[PDB]
Structures are given as structure tokens and as C-alpha cells.
RNA sequence: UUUUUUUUUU
RNA sequence: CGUAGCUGUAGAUGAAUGCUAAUUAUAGAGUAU
RNA sequence: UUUUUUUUUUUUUUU
RNA sequence: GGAAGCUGGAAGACGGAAUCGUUAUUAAGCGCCAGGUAGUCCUGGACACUGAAUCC
């Protein structure tokens, strides 16, 4: 009756991976990149090192950490009231996939380079 | 007990109550409850049976079993109690309305016997006349149409005290 | 009419008297999660968060009171209350 | 979307797009 | 019995059926038996064509053991659970050790206890005792007579995990301990080849000793020398610790030796993979919203492995899924363990079988009046489905 | 109102 | 598409949704608790 | 369709 | 200005009296957008489904 995805079992918030078998929503994407900041910084080679404190695992679960994650995630599904009819929101995975692949973030399952894809 | 409540937020059904072959039996689809109809003194009274969910591990019969078949099993056992004991079986001396049975009304522009009834959204009119058959033969035929048509579609009509 | 505000004010003061305990385990409902919601500053959200660290069923009846059990429950409440 | 009719529509619409929003009150 | 007798009902004694099936009826048959007003009436089960093909395979399998016979389980997909009410009682009457479990999910959606461990498998002390207690109701007089092998004594952990697999969880902890302790020998060039090799040789000597002293598995010291498999009464006595170790010991014991034919039937197997009603902190961000997967528990995992059917040298397993507890949808059969050549896809009841079902209810005084004129009319309404036929005829007078 | 997969369990 | 059918929970005596240390979006600018 | 499916329905259109 | 998380002991089970009217795909419910040239309403305009009864 009240299933998630509608009649066609839509899924406009998940991204598939070419390697292994593991998918996650865009909500967990923000936390994954922030946690694995040491690997990204060393890959390329103070103002640059500004998000170092956010790498803490316990800080994210605190009141301050909860607000930081929500600030970056703008909830693209929500929009203006006039966006009705043909002007409906589409899957925002196109932008997320580009950043996740360019940043060269390892997958939790298996340590690999950019292997993410839209799905 | 004789109140036909209609919940605001609910699916409307064309046939809320389903008529069965047994006289003292009726199935309610609105609340998926089983009820029995009998005349008592003068009014229609029912015994609603719960069908919602919540024990021995031998067999799933009786006791606390929250199954849709529990209501059916509780109704058959109760029906025989009235007939065997003969507590209340007696004919409905309670009348329906002025125009005989419910749904039949006299015509105002001339002498006619109208019997309106819905069937798959359609309806009928005209029915049989009254001047060409008197006030006795025409009246008898008017009631015979409603009872005959209700046995096919399995439509149950609630009788009002007034 | 106006006396009701002062009369109901005693109920708020009664909560302070019931305080000084790690958690009011006693409740009205059978479910531990539902009873835990009686405390101030906890609702349907925070009620489930506390039970996450307990490693028990959602509708788990409250077990027997133990001295060592209170310490674990009290410690989890502070972490959840931080937000 | 001020009343409970129009406001609840937004939450139900997002539920069909592959998201889970709490429902509960309002 | 035979191809000529298809779609007929076989009478069963009320008292005999209870003894043969102490747990209960197979499937939702309990909802249809309570409708009969007569208490002394027998119970009938239709003999579908799907049972004839399956029954013949079992006959040849028994005669061989006295590579032609099948050595793997089947799967019923699509009235799949209706055959269980006739295949289990018949097999039990032929001196077959049948494991009955029509409601395996009861140990995953009820009040219980969970204790996290290093192995990563949650245990249920409360539900572990009920598994053996219910199995011994009718399978007694045979387990005690069966001997016990000596090659599988005590190599299982408390949570039923093997010794080899359990000790692997501590590999990370021991890896860092040895790295810090290597400074004693590292600090005392010689040919640049032998000096490095000699240092590495010390790691092998220390690793071998470290893998046999730190770990102290419990080798069921409560029973030094067993004599049988049913004489394990200490498992029922202690429940806080010895609840899961004994459960897996019997499971492994029934693969190696071959003395009697066995059989396992797990109904409603489509509700073991989905998430359970439990709550924990093992979620992968938003995959479970803080819930324990059903397949991650102890009892559900024991009955969630079809690829291991090859080790069953005595018998085989079987499962079926027909209820509406979850939408089947695609229901991939290749990524589960079964093959495309072992799936029995049944179809709707034929018109011939439909007539018999209606007539069967008449003898039970279920219906009031069912004229033959409308017999074929009702076939199109419900479409001949068993679930839609019993419900439609129950609500109305029928016919 | 919520499904498995790239493999290290006799 | 919504009340679906179907099917789990508590066959609610306790489901009222406004108040706010706090963020989401449009806009050049909608700020302070 | 006995190696076939694995399922609710809208306000213009197969000219 | 719109929506959302968390938190929640704002004032209500009063009255079967009385005033606003419906000529049946009427009445009663529920769901969607077109324009108002950035956002910006519980009214107005406009489409679709379930859809009972009476002596009018």
C-alpha cells in the first residue's frame, strides 16, 4: 500500500558501484567524504586544513556535528511551490556521482579508486 | 444499535451490507464484522463480532486466535442456539413505514406505485400502474419486485423504526 | 478559573521531587520504550535512541532492577541528551 | 501549504521518489 | 494411489494427525478446519500433481542407499505450502527423521534476548531452548539409539562459530601486539640477504605459539566422553551460557555419519532475508535505520543456507514460499543458492480440481446451498485461486 | 509498510 | 493520485501541532530571542 | 504461458 | 515570508435548541495544476475518482 518508490518502485536517491556490491543514499555520502579526509589530502600532496576537526567520529554524533551535515545537504527534493506538473525535480545523483568519483574516495567494502556510478 | 454511521475518511462502497441466504445473518464490509439480524420485540438488534488481531500449540481452533475465520465460527454456533432454545424466532409485527416496506412510495401526480432501486449505478422507474389494477393487486406486485431483485445482487437494506 | 494555573503548578514541582534518580524505570505501559518517554526531555525520537545501545527488542518488557543495570542506562541517557 | 491537506501532500510526494519522511504528526 | 488418483482428498484421523504433527498444521490449514461445526469430522487434503513428481523422487532415493539419485534440495515457487500437509505426515510414517518448522520466524519477531560478541553473530538464549524441545516431541526413540562420532567432538564455539573462523576475529589485535614486541630482536648487513631472512624467521616462531595460548575455546568440558546424541540434558539445564553451543553441535553431527534418512522442511522462507524487528547500532548509515537483519541472528542463519545441502549425505532440505508477508517481485533465484533446474513453479487449480474442492465443503456442512447452475460461474470470479475461493465462499452463502 | 551479490567456516 | 484490497503493531480514555538558541530555499536586502 | 508473468486505475494523441 | 528536525501539561468530548439551503453523475469526502511576468494564502476561477437517501 504505502510503499517507498511508488508503483514503479522509483529510486532517485541511490548510487550504484561498478566494483563489489554496495549502495547508499546521498545522506551518507557527505559523512563518508568527511571521515576519509586524511587520504584525500595526502593524495594531492591553515586555510587548506580547515575541516580537520570534522574528521572526528564522535564529534559528528554531537549536537554541533548534526548541524554541519544538515547544512551541506540542502534537501534537493524540496523546492518551490510553483514547481508543479512537468516542472518536477529530477534525480540529483548526476552531480553527486561526479564529485564522488573525482575526489578518489575509497569504498567501505573494498579499497578502490573512483568506481562509483549512477544507479 | 440502529445507527448507520458513515466515517468521513473511508472508501465508499456500493453495497455496505451483504445479504446471505440465511434469514438471521448479514455480513458487514465497512468494518469487516459479522452480525446477525433478528426482530426481538419490535426493533432490529445485532451482535457485532471483533475481527482484529491480538495460547495452545496443538491446533489453531478457538481460544485467542486473531483470524478472520473466528467471527464466522462464532456466528454459526450462535444461530443454532436461538432455533434450538426457541427464545426469539417470531415474525416482525414491527412495521417499516406508511408505504408498506421501505423504498416504496405513492405517486402524487396520479395513481401509481413507484419502486426505485439502484443496480450497478443504473435505476428503474414507472413500475406497475395502480388505476388499471386497483389498490390491492397493484400493491402486492410493488413489494414483490423489491424482494425478487434483492436476492440476485445480494443487497441488504436496513429497516428503520420510523 | 485563574486558580487552575497555580493548582497545576504543583504538578511541575512534583517532577523535581521524583528526580535525583538515574531513570524512572517504573511506568504504566508494559513496553520499556513507551515507559521511558514519561521522563522530561525525551519523546518518540529520543526514546528509541536510548534503547539502541541496550541491544534489546523494541517492545521488550522491562527486566528486573539491578545495581549494575542502572549505571549502563544512566550513561546512555547523557550521551543521547547531548544531541 | 498551510492546512493539513496541501502540507501532507509534499511529504507523500517525496515518499514515491525513493525517500522516507517520518509522516507521524501533520 | 498413482497417476489415476489425482486431485482426491485423503481422510485423516483428528487424533492421529495431532501426534504426527505436534507443532501444528502445515500452513494456514488451521483457519479452514475451525469452520467445520462437527468436532468428530476428519481432515482431508487434496493430492495435487506437484506432490506426485516429488514423492517419486524420494522413493528412488531410499532404495539407492541400501550418483543416480538426487543429492540436493528443491524449491517451490510461483498452493506451494499445501503439499506440506501431505508430504510430511507420509514421510514420518515411513521411519524418516523429518525436521518440522512451519513458523521459523517466531524466533525473530518475538520477545527475546541478544548478547553481542566478537564473532559478530547474535545469539538467543531464550529461543535456543525451544528449538530442541519442540523437535523431540515426535522424533524421540531414534536420536538416543543413534550413535555419536568422535571426529567432531568439540570444535564449535559458544555462538556455534567454528574454531578456525572464530580465532580470525582476533588476528587484527595480535598483529599490532607482535609488531611492537619485535624491537627486542630487531636491534642486536651480513651479506644483505641472510640478515633480513633470519629476522623474519622469528615472526613465524612467535605467531605459531601466539595462536595456541591466548585463545581458550570451550570444548564442552561438561561432558567428557559422550555415548549418544540425545543424552545431552545439560543443554536444557543451563541456558545463560550453554544454549547455542549445543544447538550447532547436533547440526554438524547430522552430516558426517549415515545411518538413517533425514529430511528438513522450512516453510515461509521468503521472510528470513528481510530485516527483523530488532534494534541495534549496526546500521550502514541508512540501510536499516538501526535494525538487526534477520539473517544475522543465530537461529535464522541456521536455516538460511541452501548451498550446504551437498554435505547432507543422509537426506536433503526443502522450502516453499506462498504467503503474502512480502512482495516477491523479481525474486532472483540465482543469487540465493538454488538453481533454475530445481524450482517447481505450480499453477492455479484446474477446473477438474476446482469441482472437487467445492463438493468437499458440502459434506462438511460448511455451505448452506450451492446449486450446480452457478458452479462454473464462480470459477471466473475468484479465478480458481485457493485463497480467493475459500474467502469468497465463506463470506457469502456460496453458489 | 525496510531483500542478496564479487568470498576466509567441516 | 488519495481513501485501496491485503497485512503488522496498543479491540489509542493519552494524537489537539501553536510556542521556540536555529537551520533548508527565492531574492540586491527578510535581520535580533 | 507446465523454461509465460511475478502485477491497482486519471483529466490531448496510434489521423 | 514558506517548509522541516528536536522539544510538547494552551484551556477542546459543550450540544440532539437554533440560523444559513440541495431542482441526483446534485449533496458528502478525497487528490492534481493553470495564471497571478523571483519567493508569496485556508478565498475565487478550472479538471478527475468513490459516491447514499427522502413524502419534494
Cα E399 from Cα E376, distance rounded (Å): 10
Nearby residues of C5 by Cβ (< 8 Å), 6 or more positions away: none
Q: What are the φ/ψ torsions at residue E13 (nearest 5 degrees)?
A: -70, 140
CA distance B74 to C59: 31
Closest CA to B44 of B77, B3, B8: B3
User: Residue E287 contacts by C-beta under 8 Å, 6 or more apart in sequence?
Assistant: A24
Q: Alpha-carbon distance E350 to B38, whole Å?
A: 41
Phi, psi of E2 (to 5 degrees): 140, -175
- Which chains would you list as touching D if contact means 3+ CB atom pairs under 8 Å? A
Question: In chain C, helix, strand, coil percent, each to 5?
Answer: 60, 5, 40
In order, the DSSP letters of C11-80 are HHHHHHHH-SSS-----SSSBHHHHHTTSTT--HHHHHHHHHHHT-BTTPBP----HHHHHHHHHHHHHH
Angle between helices A26-35 and A63-72 (to 10 degrees): 120
The set of chains that have 3 or more CB pairs under 8 A with A is C, D, E
d(CA E211, CA E214): 7
Cα–Cα distance between A88 and A93 in angstroms, integer? Answer: 15
Rounded Cα distance, B126 and B117, in Å = 12
Burial status of residue E398 (CB atoms within 10 A of its CB: 0-12, 13-18, 19 or more) = buried
User: What distance lies between CA B31 and its chain's CA centroid?
Assistant: 15
Q: Are E146 and E230 in contact (CB under 8 A)?
A: yes
Of E110, E111, E280, the CB nearest to C55: E280
C-alpha cell at E247: 544447538
Which technique was the structure solved with, according to the deposited record?
cryo-EM
Q: Where are the beta strands (DSSP E) in E162-302?
A: 262-267, 275-279, 291-293
Q: Which of residues 38-97 of A touch strand I (CB under 7 A)?
A: 78, 80-82, 84-87
User: To what resolution in angstroms was this structure determined?
Assistant: 3.6
Helices (H), chain B: 69-85, 134-153
> Are E102 and E267 a contacting pair, CB within 8 Å?
yes
* Interface mutation target, options D19, D21, D23, chain A, most CBs of A under 10 Å: D19
> Other C-beta atoms within 10 Å of A93: how many?
22
Packing angle of the helix pair E49-64, E84-92 (nearest 10 deg): 30
Q: Does C79 touch chain E (CB under 8 A)?
A: no
Sign of CA dihedral E204, E209, E215, E219: positive
The 3-state DSSP class for residue E344 equals: strand
d(CA E90, CA E297): 32
Residues 6+ apart with CB under 8 A from C26: C35
Cα separation of E128 and E250, whole Å?
13
Helix (H) or strand (E) holding E206: helix E194-210
Name the residue among D1, D16, D20 with its Cβ closest to that of A10. D16
Nearest by CB: E34 against B21, B57, B61: B61
Query: Which are the residues after which chain A is interrupted (C to N > 2.5 Å)?
Result: 45
Q: Measure CA E197 to chain center.
A: 52
Q: Which residue's C-alpha cell is 465508499?
A: B12
Copy the grid coordinates of residue A115: 568506481
| Nearest CB partner across the interface for E368, out of B22, B62, B72 | B22
CB pairs under 8 A between B and E: 53
**Beta-sheet strand order (sheet of A116-118):** A24-25, A14-17, A116-118
Q: Which residues contact B66 (CB under 8 A, 6 or more apart)?
A: B52, B53, B54
Of E10, E21, E20, E18, the C-alpha closest to E43 is: E10
Span CA (E231) to C1' (G30), Å? 80
A15/A27 Cα distance (integer angstroms): 11
Which residues, at least 6 apart from A61, have a Cβ–Cβ distance to it below 8 Å?
A: none
3-state secondary structure of E27: coil
Q: DSSP string of D4-25? A: HHHHHHHHHHHHTTT-----S-
Q: Which residue has the cell 475461493?
A: E389
Helix (H) or strand (E) holding E99: strand E97-101
Strand I neighbours among C 15-54, CB < 7 A: 40-47
CA angle in degrees (0–180, nearest 5) for E382-E388-E390: 115
In three-state secondary structure terms, A96 is: helix
For chain E, list the contacting chains (3+ Cβ pairs, <8 Å).
Answer: A, B, C
Of E232, E227, E56, the C-alpha closest to E146 is E227
- Which stretch of DSSP H or E encloses residue E12? strand E9-12
Residues 6+ apart with CB under 8 A from E121: E159, E160, E161, E296, E297, E298, E301
The secondary structure of residue E162, as a DSSP letter, is B
Round to whole Å and give the CA distance between E272 and E337.
Answer: 14
Closest CA to A112 of A25, A36, A56: A36
Residue E379: partners with Cβ closer than 8 Å, 6 or more residues away: E351, E354
Q: Is the CB of E78 less than 7 A from some atom of nucleic acid strand H? A: yes
Tell whether C48 is within 8 A of chain E (Cβ). yes
E161 touches strand F (CB under 7 A): yes
Instruction: DSSP letter for E72, please.
Output: S
Give CA torsion, residues A9, A14, A17, A21, to 10 deg: -60
Residue C81, Cα to own-chain centre: how many angstroms?
12
The secondary structure of chain A in percent helix, strand, coil, rounded to multiples of 5, reads: 40, 10, 55
Rounded CA-CA distance E25/B67 in Å is: 15
Reading the block at residue E213, the C-alpha cell is 595460548
Alpha-carbon separation of residue E76 from E146, E262, E340 (angstroms): 31, 19, 12
Helix (H, G, I), strand (E, B) or coil at E299: helix
> What sign has the CA pseudo-torsion E208, E211, E213, E218?
negative
In strand H, the nucleotides that come within 7 Å of a protein beta carbon are: 2-9
Q: What whole-number distance in Å separates Cα of residue E245 and Cα of residue E154?
A: 9
B16 and E393 in contact (C-beta within 8 Å)? no
Of E275, E233, E257, E254, nearest in space to E109 by CA: E275
Dmax over Cα atoms in chain C, in whole Å?
48
Give the residue among C15, C53, C68, C57 at the shortest CA–CA distance from C32: C57
Side-chain-facing half-sphere of A32: CA atoms under 13 Å: 21
Q: CA dist E156 to E218, E249, E282, Å?
A: 8, 7, 25
Instruction: Kindly compute the dihedral angle of the four CA atoms of residues E185, E190, E191, E194, in this order, to the nearest 10 degrees.
Output: -30
The C-alpha angle with vertex E329 and arms to E104 and E318, in degrees rounded to 5, equals 35
Q: For residue E122, give the C-alpha cell.
A: 547474535
Q: How far apart are CA E166 and CA E118, in angstroms?
A: 8
The residues near E399 (Cβ < 8 Å, ≥ 6 apart) are E367, E369, E370, E371, E374, E375, E378
Cell of E241: 551460557
**Sign of the alpha-carbon torsion through A9, A11, A14, A17:** positive
Cα distance between residue E117 and residue E157, in whole Å: 11
Residue closest to E126 by CA, chosen among E305, E298, E304, E302: E298
In which element (H, E) is residue E44 found?
strand E43-46
HSE of C8 in the Cβ direction (CA atoms, 13 Å)?
5
Residues in chain D: 26
Q: Judging by beta carbons within 10 Å of its beta carbon (0-12, 13-18, 19+), is residue E202 exposed, middle or buried? A: middle
The C-alpha atoms of residue E383 and residue E388 are separated, in whole angstroms, by 8
Residue with cell 500449540: B57
Q: Give C55 to chain E, closest Cα distance, Å.
A: 6
Report the phi/psi class of residue E100: left, alpha or beta, with left for phi > 0 and alpha for psi in -120 to 50.
beta
Residue E318 backbone class (left: φ over 0; alpha: ψ -120 to 50; beta: rest): beta
Nearest CA in chain C to E276: C57
- Please report the beta strands in B5-150, taking only residues with DSSP state E, as ranges in sequence order: 17-19, 26-28, 33-35, 104-106, 113-115, 118-119, 122-123
Cβ contacts of E95 within 8 Å, gap of 6 or more:
E260
Q: Is A20 a known ligand-binding residue? A: yes
SS3 E329: coil
Q: Is there a contact between C58 and E277 if contact means CB atoms under 8 Å apart?
A: yes
Whether residue E268 contacts residue E104, with contact meaning beta carbons closer than 8 Å, is answered with: yes
Q: Say if the Cβ atoms of A10 and D18 lie within 8 Å.
A: yes
The neighbour count for residue B130, using CB atoms within 10 Å, is: 21
Residue located via cell numbers 517481485: E329
Q: Quick check: B49 and B74 in contact, CB under 8 A?
A: yes
What is the helix (H) or strand (E) element at residue E355, kind and residue range?
helix E351-363
Do E5 and E55 touch, CB atoms closer than 8 A?
A: no
Q: What is the DSSP letter of E295?
A: G
Strands E316-320 and E74-77: parallel
Amino acid at each position: 500500500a504505502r510503499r517507498v518508490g511508488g508503483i514503479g518502485r522509483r529510486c532517485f536517491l541511490t548510487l550504484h558501484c561498478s566494483a563489489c556490491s554496495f549502495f547508499f543514499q546521498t545522506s551518507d555520502a557527505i559523512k563518508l567524504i568527511l571521515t576519509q579526509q586524511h587520504h584525500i589530502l595526502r593524495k594531492k600532496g591553515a586555510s587548506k586544513f580547515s575541516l580537520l576537526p570534522l574528521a572526528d567520529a564522535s564529534l559528528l554524533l554531537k549536537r554541533r556535528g548534526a548541524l554541519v551535515l544538515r547544512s551541506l545537504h540542502g534537501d534537493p527534493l524540496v523546492g518551490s511551490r510553483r514547481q508543479r506538473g512537468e516542472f518536477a525535480p529530477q534525480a540529483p545523483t548526476a552531480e553527486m556521482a561526479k564529485m564522488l568519483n573525482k575526489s578518489c574516495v575509497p569504498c567501505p567494502r573494498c579499497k578502490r579508486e573512483g568506481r562509483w556510478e549512477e544507479g | 444499535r440502529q445507527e448507520f454511521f458513515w466515517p468521513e475518511k473511508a472508501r465508499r462502497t456500493r453495497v455496505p451490507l451483504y445479504q446471505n441466504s440465511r434469514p438471521n445473518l448479514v455480513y458487514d464490509q465497512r468494518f469487516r464484522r459479522f452480525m446477525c439480524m433478528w426482530y426481538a420485540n419490535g426493533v432490529q438488534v445485532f451482535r457485532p463480532f471483533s475481527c482484529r488481531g491480538r495460547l495452545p500449540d496443538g491446533l489453531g481452533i478457538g481460544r485467542g486466535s486473531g483470524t478472520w475465520e473466528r467471527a464466522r465460527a462464532k456466528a454459526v454456533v450462535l444461530l443454532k442456539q436461538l432455533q434450538r432454545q426457541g427464545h426469539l424466532d417470531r415474525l416482525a409485527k414491527p412495521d417499516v413505514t406508511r408505504s408498506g416496506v421501505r423504498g416504496v412510495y405513492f405517486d402524487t401526480e396520479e395513481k401509481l406505485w413507484v419502486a426505485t432501486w439502484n443496480e450497478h449505478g443504473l435505476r428503474r422507474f414507472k413500475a406497475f400502474p395502480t388505476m388499471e389494477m386497483g389498490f390491492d393487486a397493484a400493491y402486492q406486485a410493488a413489494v414483490a419486485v423489491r424482494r425478487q431483485k434483492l436476492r440476485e445482487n445480494y443487497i441488504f437494506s436496513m429497516q428503520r423504526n420510523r | 478559573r485563574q486558580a487552575k494555573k497555580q493548582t497545576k503548578l504543583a504538578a511541575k514541582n512534583a517532577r523535581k521531587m521524583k528526580e535525583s534518580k538515574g531513570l524512572l524505570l517504573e511506568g504504566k505501559k508494559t513496553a520499556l520504550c513507551m515507559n521511558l518517554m514519561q521522563n522530561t526531555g525525551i519523546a518518540w525520537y529520543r526514546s528509541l535512541q536510548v534503547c539502541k545501545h541496550l541491544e534489546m527488542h523494541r517492545r521488550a518488557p522491562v527486566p528486573r532492577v539491578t545495581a549494575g543495570f542502572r549505571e549502563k542506562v544512566t550513561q546512555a541517557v547523557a550521551v543521547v541528551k547531548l544531541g | 501549504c498551510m492546512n493539513k491537506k496541501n502540507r501532507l501532500a509534499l511529504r507523500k510526494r517525496r515518499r514515491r521518489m525513493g525517500e522516507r519522511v517520518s509522516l507521524r504528526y501533520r | 494411489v498413482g497417476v489415476e488418483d489425482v486431485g482426491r482428498f485423503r481422510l485423516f484421523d483428528r487424533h492421529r494427525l495431532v501426534e504426527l504433527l505436534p507443532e501444528g498444521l502445515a500452513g494456514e490449514l488451521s483457519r479452514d478446519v475451525e469452520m467445520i461445526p462437527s468436532a468428530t469430522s476428519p481432515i482431508g487434503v487434496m493430492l495435487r500433481k506437484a506432490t506426485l513428481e516429488l514423492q517419486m523422487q524420494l522413493e528412488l532415493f531410499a532404495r539407492v542407499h541400501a550418483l543416480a539419485a538426487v543429492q540436493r534440495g528443491f524449491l517451490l515457487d510461483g498452493g506451494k505450502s499445501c503439499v506440506l500437509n501431505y508430504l510430511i505426515p507420509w514421510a514420518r510414517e515411513n521411519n524418516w527423521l523429518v525436521v518440522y518448522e512451519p513458523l521459523p520466524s517466531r524466533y525473530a519477531r518475538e520477545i527475546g534476548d541478544i548478547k553481542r560478541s566478537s564473532a559478530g553473530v547474535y545469539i538467543q538464549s531464550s529461543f535456543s531452548q525451544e528449538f530442541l524441545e519442540r523437535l523431540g516431541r515426535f522424533n524421540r526413540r531414534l536420536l538416543e539409539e543413534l550413535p555419536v562420532a568422535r571426529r567432531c567432538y568439540g570444535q564449535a564455539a559458544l555462538d556455534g562459530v567454528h574454531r578456525l573462523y572464530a580465532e580470525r576475529s582476533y588476528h587484527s589485535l595480535l598483529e599490532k601486539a607482535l609488531e611492537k614486541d619485535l624491537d627486542e630482536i630487531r636491534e642486536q648487513l651480513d651479506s644483505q640477504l641472510r640478515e633480513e631472512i633470519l629476522l623474519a624467521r622469528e615472526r613465524l616462531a612467535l605467531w605459531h605459539t601466539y595462536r595456541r595460548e591466548v585463545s581458550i575455546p570451550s570444548m564442552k568440558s561438561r561432558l567428557p566422553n559422550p555415548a549418544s546424541v540425545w543424552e545431552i540434558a545439560e543443554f536444557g539445564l543451563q541456558n545463560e551460557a550453554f544454549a547455542t553451543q549445543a544447538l550447532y553441535e547436533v547440526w554438524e553431527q547430522l552430516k558426517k555419519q549415515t545411518q538413517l534418512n533425514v529430511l528438513i522442511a522450512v516453510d515461509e522462507w521468503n521472510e528470513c532475508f528481510p530485516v527483523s524487528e530488532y534494534v541495534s547500532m549496526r546500521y550502514e548509515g541508512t540501510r536499516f535505520n538501526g535494525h538487526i537483519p534477520a539473517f544475522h541472528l543465530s537461529t535464522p542463519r541456521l536455516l538460511s543456507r541452501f548451498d550446504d545441502a551437498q554435505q547432507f549425505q543422509r537426506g536433503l532440505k526443502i522450502c516453499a514460499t506462498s504467503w503474502r508477508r512480502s512482495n516477491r517481485r523479481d525474486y532472483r533465484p540465482d543469487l540465493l543458492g538454488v538453481r533454475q533446474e530445481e524450482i517447481r513453479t505450480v499453477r492455479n487449480f484446474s477446473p477438474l480440481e476446482f469441482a472437487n474442492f467445492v463438493a468437499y465443503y458440502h459434506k462438511k456442512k460448511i455451505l448452506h446451498e450451492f446449486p450446480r447452475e452457478k458452479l462454473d460461474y464462480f470459477y471466473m470470479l475468484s479465478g480458481g485461486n485457493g485463497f480467493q475461493a475459500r474467502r469468497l465462499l465463506a463470506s457469502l452463502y456460496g453458489g
